[PDB]
Amino acid sequence: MVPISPIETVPVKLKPGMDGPKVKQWPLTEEKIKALVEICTEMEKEGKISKIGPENPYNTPVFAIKKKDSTKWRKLVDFRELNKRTQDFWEVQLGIPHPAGLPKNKSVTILDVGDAYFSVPLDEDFRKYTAFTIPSINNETPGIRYQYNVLPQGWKGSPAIFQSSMTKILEPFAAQNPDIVIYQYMDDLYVGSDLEIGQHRTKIEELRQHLLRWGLTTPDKKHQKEPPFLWMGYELHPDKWTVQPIVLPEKDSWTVNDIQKLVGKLNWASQIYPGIKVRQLSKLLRGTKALTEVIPLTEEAELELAENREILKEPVHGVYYDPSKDLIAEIQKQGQGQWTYQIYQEPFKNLKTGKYARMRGAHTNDVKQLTEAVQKITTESIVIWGKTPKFKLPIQKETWETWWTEYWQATWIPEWEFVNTPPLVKLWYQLEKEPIVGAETFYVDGAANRETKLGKAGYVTNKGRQKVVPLTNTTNQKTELQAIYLALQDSGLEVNIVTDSQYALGIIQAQPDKSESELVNQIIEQLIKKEKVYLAWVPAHKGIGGNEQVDKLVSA
Amino acid sequence: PIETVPVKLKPGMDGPKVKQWPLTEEKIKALVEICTEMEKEGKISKIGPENPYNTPVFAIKKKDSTKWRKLVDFRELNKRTQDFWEVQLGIPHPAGLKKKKSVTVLDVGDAYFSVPLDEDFRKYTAFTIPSINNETPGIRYQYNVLPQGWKGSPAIFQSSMTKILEPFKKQNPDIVIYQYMDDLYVGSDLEIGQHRTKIEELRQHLLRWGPPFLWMGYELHPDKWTVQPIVLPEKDSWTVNDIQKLVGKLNWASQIYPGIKVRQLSKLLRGTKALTEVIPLTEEAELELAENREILKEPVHGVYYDPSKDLIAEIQKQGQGQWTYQIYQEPFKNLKTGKYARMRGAHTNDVKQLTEAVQKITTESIVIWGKTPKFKLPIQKETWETWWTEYWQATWIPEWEFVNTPPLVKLWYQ
Numbered sequence: 001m002v003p004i005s006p007i008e009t010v011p012v013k014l015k016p017g018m019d020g021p022k023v024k025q026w027p028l029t030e031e032k033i034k035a036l037v038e039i040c041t042e043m044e045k046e047g048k049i050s051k052i053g054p055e056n057p058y059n060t061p062v063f064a065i066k067k068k069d070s071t072k073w074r075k076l077v078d079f080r081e082l083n084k085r086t087q088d089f090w091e092v093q094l095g096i097p098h099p100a101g102l103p104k105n106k107s108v109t110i111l112d113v114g115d116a117y118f119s120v121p122l123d124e125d126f127r128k129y130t131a132f133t134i135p136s137i138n139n140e141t142p143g144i145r146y147q148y149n150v151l152p153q154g155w156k157g158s159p160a161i162f163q164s165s166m167t168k169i170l171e172p173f174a175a176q177n178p179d180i181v182i183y184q185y186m187d188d189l190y191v192g193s194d195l196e197i198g199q200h201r202t203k204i205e206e207l208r209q210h211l212l213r214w215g216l217t218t219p220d221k222k223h224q225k226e227p228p229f230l231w232m233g234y235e236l237h238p239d240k241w242t243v244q245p246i247v248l249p250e251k252d253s254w255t256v257n258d259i260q261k262l263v264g265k266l267n268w269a270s271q272i273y274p275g276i277k278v279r280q281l282s283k284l285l286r287g288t289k290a291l292t293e294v295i296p297l298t299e300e301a302e303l304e305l306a307e308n309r310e311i312l313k314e315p316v317h318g319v320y321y322d323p324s325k326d327l328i329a330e331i332q333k334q335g336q337g338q339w340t341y342q343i344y345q346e347p348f349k350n351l352k353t354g355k356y357a358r359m360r361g362a363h364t365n366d367v368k369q370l371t372e373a374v375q376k377i378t379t380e381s382i383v384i385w386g387k388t389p390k391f392k393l394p395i396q397k398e399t400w401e402t403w404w405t406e407y408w409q410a411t412w413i414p415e416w417e418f419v420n421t422p423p424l425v426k427l428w429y430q431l432e433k434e435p436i437v438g439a440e441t442f443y444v445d446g447a448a449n450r451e452t453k454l455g456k457a458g459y460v461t462n463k464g465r466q467k468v469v470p471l472t473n474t475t476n477q478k479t480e481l482q483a484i485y486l487a488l489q490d491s492g493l494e495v496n497i498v499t500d501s502q503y504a505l506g507i508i509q510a511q512p513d514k515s516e517s518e519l520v521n522q523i524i525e526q527l528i529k530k531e532k533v534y535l536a537w538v539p540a541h542k543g544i545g546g547n548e549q550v551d552k553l554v555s556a
Numbered sequence: 557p558i559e560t561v562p563v564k565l566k567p568g569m570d571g572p573k574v575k576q577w578p579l580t581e582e583k584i585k586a587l588v589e590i591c592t593e594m595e596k597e598g599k600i601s602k603i604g605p606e607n608p609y610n611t612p613v614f615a616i617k618k619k620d621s622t623k624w625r626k627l628v629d630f631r632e633l634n635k636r637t638q639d640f641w642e643v644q645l646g647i648p649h650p651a652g653l654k655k656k657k658s659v660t661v662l663d664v665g666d667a668y669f670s671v672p673l674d675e676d677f678r679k680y681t682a683f684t685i686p687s688i689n690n691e692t693p694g695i696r697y698q699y700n701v702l703p704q705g706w707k708g709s710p711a712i713f714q715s716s717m718t719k720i721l722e723p724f725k726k727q728n729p730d731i732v733i734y735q736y737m738d739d740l741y742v743g744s745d746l747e748i749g750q751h752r753t754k755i756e757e758l759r760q761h762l763l764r765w766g767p768p769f770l771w772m773g774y775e776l777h778p779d780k781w782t783v784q785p786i787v788l789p790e791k792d793s794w795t796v797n798d799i800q801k802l803v804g805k806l807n808w809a810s811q812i813y814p815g816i817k818v819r820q821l822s823k824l825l826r827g828t829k830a831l832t833e834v835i836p837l838t839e840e841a842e843l844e845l846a847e848n849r850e851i852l853k854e855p856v857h858g859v860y861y862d863p864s865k866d867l868i869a870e871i872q873k874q875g876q877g878q879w880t881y882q883i884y885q886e887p888f889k890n891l892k893t894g895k896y897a898r899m900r901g902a903h904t905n906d907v908k909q910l911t912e913a914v915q916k917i918t919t920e921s922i923v924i925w926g927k928t929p930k931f932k933l934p935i936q937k938e939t940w941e942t943w944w945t946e947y948w949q950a951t952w953i954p955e956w957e958f959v960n961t962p963p964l965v966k967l968w969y970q
């Protein structure tokens with residue numbers, strides 16, 4: 001007998017004020033009972049479970065299931081009630097590595113620690129809660145009761161305690177062998193390195209000689225896979241990586257189950273397939289809750305679907321990360337809030353791709369969206385590579401310089417360079433800082449009755465030019481914007497506009513180039529045609545000449 | 557330090573479950589080096605999966621320093637930790653701290669590592685050193701001693717801190733000392749000639765009674781901190797646009813000051829005139845401008861600091877490296893106004909300027925009232941949360957909210 005190092009137990013407690021489960025055992029058939037007694041007899045002699053007496057008041061129902069071809073029954077303890085009463089744990093398996101950040105590792109050996117999963121002991125002060133009773137034949141004898149001595153399959157804390165216990169054991173080995181990387185996931189250990197295979201297996205056998213010191217039989221995986229590894233929906237080759245075959249069906253009646261199908265596949269493919277759109281397909285996802293109704297396809301969504309089909313014809317592959325080279329990310333505008341980017345180190349070979357969707361709002365511009373896309377790529381790059389990449393942006397240095405110096409908010413973009421890839425982000429209009437000399441001054445105002453929704457809007461100018469337009473089905477805020485549009489429509493290339501609308505100022509000072517309101521979009525189109533525009537604000541109902549004259553004409 | 561102080565949370569509140577935000581490789585390696593030494597010194601210990609709590613952590617570099625510092629975001633833990641009245645029912649803030657001349661700010665945070673923490677509270681200080689690309693599980697730790705940036709650290713050490721400060725309080729009676737979190741504010745009414753030697757008298761005085769960042773003292777001068785009252789332009793020729801901006805400023809000031817009138821200043825804009833046309837001031841309108849000018853010379857009546865209500869800090873970007881700010885508890889009742897200029901190390905980075913501005917305003921708010929205000933930042937949420945940690949240099953972190961609508965008050969504070 002060779003001494004083994006004991007695995008340190010994790011102290012587990014129930015939730016405060018809660019007790020263990022006390023669920024009645026299901027009446028099982030005679031064939032299931034004989035199967036459960038035979039397997040629990042083997043699990044007991046292996047030290048996984050142990051018999052108990054009638055003192056334990058807790059109980060958990062145990063079931064017996066059978067597969068298709070395998071003529072073998074298997075137990076299944078339903079710890080659903082115990083998991084509700086067990087404390088919360090720290091899950092160390094929430095995130096998944098992205099292949100674009102994983103470097104080259106030629107030698108690879110995948111081990112199976114399945115027999116080590118049931119070797120980690122459970123806290124002895126908590127084993128009494130894992131009680132389960134196997135019903136007796138014809139209910140004529142007391143049911144045989146066991147309790148788990150190791151981490152049970154299906155328990156809340158089993159995955160986290162196992163990985164924590166495995167990480168604690170692998171720490172000295174992963175520290176004294178820096179040329180070896182070990183990835184933990186489920187009952188599998190993914191070991192890789194860049195050394196020749198002769199040195200790899202020897203260190204693999206060293207890992208097998210390290211885990212046996214805790215008594216963990218860890219051999220090679222049965223039926224080792226081919227070079228293209230199928231790992232979390234990816235195809236992992238030695239020098240390249242890609243996603244498993246994802247092809248969209250050709251249908252004519254799409255329902256809601258196909259709603260999470262196209263979006264799920266296109267978003268999962270945007271990480272390697274460039275230029276992928278899904279917004280026109282996602283706009284049909286506003287208020288559909290059930291999973292059976294049909295939605296007719298718009299030709300804007302069909303054209304978008306056909307554009308992605310041409311990209312999904314030939315498979316695109318990505319390269320692995322090289323820390324010796326720089327990290328570069330280039331962004332392109334696709335239209336209507338659509339943005340796509342490519343991340344690479346050497347040209348014509350991307351590490352990964354992606355897309356950014358415009359944050360929905362009333363008003364926006366391309367500079368905000370590009371800025372938001374940069375912050376999204378920045379955070380994603382810190383996750384995968386731990387560093388901010390150099391950006392290639394389709395915006396002039398002068399355009400960005402004018403933007404951030406005059407924008408009312410604070411804004412910043414990390415180190416970037418301009419790339420001439422149309423369409424380019426440009427400032428469509430810039431308001432003046434001071435009043436314009438020689439330009440006609442338009443005093444505008446608007447008003448509307450809150451009951452009948454009848455309103456007026458217009459302007460008065462220093463040259464005697466006037467206009468008042470009656471409006472139907474409008475509001476006070478809408479007449480204030482209408483008066484601005486009228487002043488821009490009837491003025492020359494240079495114009496000074498005087499308004500008292502704080503609502504209209506907040507929209508224009510936000511500098512939008514596109515909005516969901518047709519009236520604001522008409523104002524923007526008017527601003528682009530101008531050469532100089534100065535917008536000035538005055539307090540209303542304060543005897544300001546020109547402002548009160550136009551106020552009484554719209555107030556009826 | 558042997559006996560622990562029983563620390564509890566607020567009734568019906570669990571510990572913090574805040575997710576660790578991604579960190580660069582240079583910050584991860586720096587925190588691993590720092591936490592490895594702290595683990596050898598017994599300040600922190602590894603924890604298992606039975607501890608589900610977490611508090612974010614990141615690495616900074618102090619002002620005029622070349623060594624990384626471990627900074628913890630105990631904001632969620634501090635608001636869940638109970639109010640510390642275990643000794644004093646509440647210390648009124650020293651009003652003389654803001655009337656002194658030269659105030660030095662030290663970092664007595666390392667002195668907190670000599671006092672152990674209640675074993676029943678150590679699990680709530682859990683933090684995670686994240687891994688890159690989810691390669692390995694994050695390194696999990698918890699504090700065995702009083703951590704820097706925790707609300708209870710200066711309150712628990714307040715019993716031992718005073719015993720070290722008594723031999724110096726007896727030496728100088730007219731010197732004001734104030735402690736907030738990991739900072740000790742030392743102010744004196746004498747010039748900087750002996751101020752360096754007087755603070756140096758306090759540096760090794762703390763070490764011999766028990767430090768990486770205890771050698772530097774952030775100097776302040778609150779006696780010369782300028783305020784920004786409402787000022788009206790003095791012009792010899794007024795255009796229509798100038799008068800329009802004047803009445804708009806006086807109408808805004810009318811909500812703060814009573815008696816402000818704009819009637820005589822409106823009768824000059826009579827008619828539909830061009831913005832660039834000069835309007836001569838009548839003597840009746842000049843009297844109204846003089847009356848309003850004298851009203852603004854006086855401070856706001858009916859203003860007061862209520863220690864029960866929170867402080868609010870608004871910031872407006874004025875351009876050319878100029879940032880104006882206001883501190884208040886009630887709208888239009890400003891407790892202090894100010895203006896910064898020429899942010900060092902940030903000429904093409906508004907984020908770094910705004911970040912440093914938040915630190916300076918919070919520092920001023922500590923000296924005056926002894927607490928931090930909630931900020932209204934003129935910046936998108938995604939841009940601020942991505943870069944503010946890169947320029948942060950203080951041991952404390954205030955609360956902040958984001959302003960998405962351009963304020964019209966910017967034109968008047970300019």
Ligand SMILES: COc1cc2nc(NC3CCN(Cc4ccc(C(N)=O)cc4)CC3)nc(Oc3c(C)cc(C#N)cc3C)c2cc1OC
Pocket residue numbers: 097102103104105106107108181182183190191192227229230231236237238239320691692
């Ligand atoms: C710096 O830390 C790490 C770096 C890692 N690098 C990598 N890089 C990988 C290495 C494998 N190759 C395919 C291949 C390459 C040649 C061959 C061959 N010639 O037989 C077969 C397959 C793809 C790229 N894999 C890590 O963990 C793995 C992950 C996350 C998934 C799988 C799978 N299934 C396997 C492993 C080993 C890393 C873990 C690290 O830390 C924990």
Ligand SMILES: [Mg+2]
Pocket residue numbers: 445446500540551
């Ligand atoms: Mg009006």
